[PDB]
Ligand binder design. Sequence first.
Ligand SMILES: CCCC(=O)SCCNC(=O)CCNC(=O)[C@H](O)C(C)(C)COP(=O)(O)OP(=O)(O)OC[C@H]1O[C@@H](n2cnc3c(N)ncnc32)[C@H](O)[C@@H]1OP(=O)(O)O
Length: 1053
Amino acid sequence: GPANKVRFVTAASLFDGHDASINIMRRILQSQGCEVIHLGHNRSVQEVVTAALQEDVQGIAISSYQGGHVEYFKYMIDLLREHGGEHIQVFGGGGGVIVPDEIRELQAYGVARIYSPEDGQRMGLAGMITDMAQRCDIDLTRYAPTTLDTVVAGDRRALAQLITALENGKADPELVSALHAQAKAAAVPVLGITGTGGAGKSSLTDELIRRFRLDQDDALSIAVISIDPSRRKSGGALLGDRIRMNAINHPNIFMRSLATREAGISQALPDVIAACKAARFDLVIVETSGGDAAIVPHVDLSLYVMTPEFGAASQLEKIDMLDFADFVAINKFDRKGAQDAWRDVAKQVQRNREQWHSRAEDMPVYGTQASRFNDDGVTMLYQGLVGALGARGMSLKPGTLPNLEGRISTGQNVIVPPARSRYLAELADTVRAYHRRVVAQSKLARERQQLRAAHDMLQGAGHESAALETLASERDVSLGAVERKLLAMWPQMQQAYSGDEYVEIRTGLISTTLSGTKIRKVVLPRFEDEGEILKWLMRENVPGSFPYTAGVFAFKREGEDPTRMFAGEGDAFRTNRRFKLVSEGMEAKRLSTAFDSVTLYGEDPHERPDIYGKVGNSGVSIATLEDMKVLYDGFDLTNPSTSVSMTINGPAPTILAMFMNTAIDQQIDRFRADNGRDPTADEEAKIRAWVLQNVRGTVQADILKEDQGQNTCIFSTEFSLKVMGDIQEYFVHHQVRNFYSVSISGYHIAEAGANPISQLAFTLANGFTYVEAYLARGMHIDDFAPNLSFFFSNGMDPEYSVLGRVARRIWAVTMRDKYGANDRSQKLKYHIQTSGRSLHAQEIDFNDIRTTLQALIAIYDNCNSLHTNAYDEAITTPTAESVRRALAIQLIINREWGVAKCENPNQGSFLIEELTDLVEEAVLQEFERIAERGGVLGAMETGYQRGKIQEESLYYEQLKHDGTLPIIGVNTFRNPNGDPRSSEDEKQSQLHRLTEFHGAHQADAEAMLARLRQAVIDNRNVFAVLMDAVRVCSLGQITHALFEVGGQYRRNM
Ligand SMILES: CCCC(=O)SCCNC(=O)CCNC(=O)[C@H](O)C(C)(C)COP(=O)(O)OP(=O)(O)OC[C@H]1O[C@@H](n2cnc3c(N)ncnc32)[C@H](O)[C@@H]1OP(=O)(O)O
């Protein structure tokens, strides 16, 4: 532990989701005795600086892995000098993105240190943190004011420094007494908010502060004192209440996180409060963790916060806080037994107050749900607090908020009903039951054949025993209806695949080799045993037949390969050229779009250094519908041989609306060109409706994965799911049957370290959650199931070879048995991308070897779409030459490779069938573990997924570093000889195209945006409005509109 109390503010830069490294740095800082105010990811400079200034820290640690770091730090250094924080030292992350010329530049600008990857290897990760902590080991109490004149005047930076003095007991004794004297005469209300651990203390507080801002039109000056007993023996702590605060980013709001001993509230808080009271605030809010009623004698009003899980009704007779609390908030009122929790608590408070002459429903016990946007429950609690604070001497304007009455929150958008909690377990039983039938029916089919076989052998010998036939006849009825038809069609099935054509229409079955050998596309088994035949027909039928283990289609398509390559760079014009380069000479126009971090967060490009640096870098910059049209110019989106994939999650409904309008306008253009006249009202509507049906493509939009470790979500999970459903409803209404609403991904999960079994199980579980959610909404299974794309990562692990086939069978069986859906719904279609986790910077030429083997098993196992990574993936975005080597891997396997001429080469293999069985079972067991945690959503409350992933990640690293798990070129066979974005004009282009778009729709802008908000308030279809909104509004405008009526995502520690 250092001399002074070293405080830090840590965060990831704006639009930066790579918050994996900064969460490691804040651990080492914490362990070395530093109080860390962690801000999480996606933090603007204006945010980080405001935090640093209010907390009054010695140092700031910022990680930047999305680029644009130079403009970012320059902004922060500038903004810190302007608002009295030049003594605060800014540090750069361990990102190897920043070249030496930029490190030297920024350090010369004002940045304390930027640690090069060279410094990482030399000093060590703990070494860099130790250096950074020692630099910030300075006393900040000397910068504190000596007169209250500054603080009382309204200076918040002076207040922040004054507190640093008061907290360290280095303030003048005469100054302190004069401070309390000022506070006593100030007469300002102090609300205390205490509660049990993990009850939503900060979440509810933030929402309550938001209530204050909305109700009083940001007229109130609120100071927030967060108290966390994390301060260990080393002196280090973690102050993570600020990360959950979204409504504090405003000049009238001030927040200070205090780290107190885990044993003993020190005599510092009543001073800190007095300081805020003297700073002429309107209201001081003080919150604590796990409830400790050591805050009661220091506040005017106390608020006990709890969850419905309090145990038996007798436990409430032990809680001292229920005897003092002026208000009680039962937060997370969406949980089970919340209703009974309310009556138990309300009765207990009535008993404690001995108010038998009152109604239990009148008690200050509120059922709140801070997680739900604009929750009336929270508002009801707020209405109560105001009346209490108002009577206790506080000036308040008449409220603008709906002054509704009641005590409990009025329900919520129930995603997965508690009755369907065990849905994953039910599916596990569904599959296992199918297998037990396979075993039983197989034995029946075997015996039936054995009897009639032995019966015929007796007639050839002479003596006959018809008693054998009596037993065989019993087997005929014992065998199921579908099982019997399977064996019946088997000889006929063999004749079909026997010929050279699959005879109406015909299809080639045989590809003749260079030697003259005939290679059958689909090779059928040669089993004599009818038990084996039935067993095979039920467990792994031919491609295109239930359970579609070897594929969902009969034969691989001649027109389109599974090839679909990831692209996206600079502005729409540049990517449009890269799209043509990849699909050069191919009838199969299969595009895969990647957006820049600015677009991925639903923002418009802007001059501000925060955003400007990010524009165009690492993905195409798409801000308006015009940009979208340029992106796919020339390409016929409605053409049957053209599918367009696009990677977007948060802003997915808006981007999809743009893509739809683009595809529609392409045909309106093609009509005005072919006829020379614009289509009439009836002609246009006929065209528009046709486009929606026949348009092919896929948008990712996996929201549940964004809270699984990616951390790139901008909207509240509940809101996104509502709009997600709005899209899926829209697809149904207009018969959009060629577009996939959500590409349920598991790639990001795998990159995080998850082994194949975990990746597959979680992804399927997530997919099943989306299914359960839509069913609870009221959609039919055959309406949304055929619109479900999947996304997996292929690594080197054995389980990857049988991943796709397992995913297909688990889906096909459950969809037919559990949900009773049609054939089109039982067919799981997925996209496989080779693993980037297996691609290393050490010996990059080896990566093509790994990417080949992964591509092979993907193609072997009849994947629906394949992306191949470049050999220099660990260093930069795929270059021009390097994207050809990636594309050649697919071309060589599909065209040159002989075994690939056969479309079911996996089938029959003893290894494949065993691995298929093993992996399938392992997934089912994982389904069960998640089910007994409340389903996927319930498990995410515990952070079960994120936890397991982080575990398996470290187990991989524990073996890779050790040498147990060999990696060629990395931990073995190391090389003796080998020791070791976006044009400025393009950024200006996007800015000009934006302001040009904005001026062109200035009249219809606000009108459309207001309509969009009202559609959320009136609980209408959001996507339906977006289909009109994107034609007069930009991405940023639409996103910001929804922020006001859908709320922003709240960060998790
Ligand atoms: C670090 C960041 C990494 C990332 O995020 S990368 C993610 C990017 N996303 C992707 O690469 C893939 C996107 N998803 C997709 O392309 C699709 O969802 C999918 C299902 C994988 C592929 O779709 P498509 O290739 O267009 O084909 P499809 O399965 O939708 O079906 C099209 C219709 O055409 C027909 N068809 C195509 N191939 C056939 C065949 N072999 N046999 C018989 N019929 C066939 C068929 O009619 C089918 O429609 P339907 O099955 O009758 O409803």
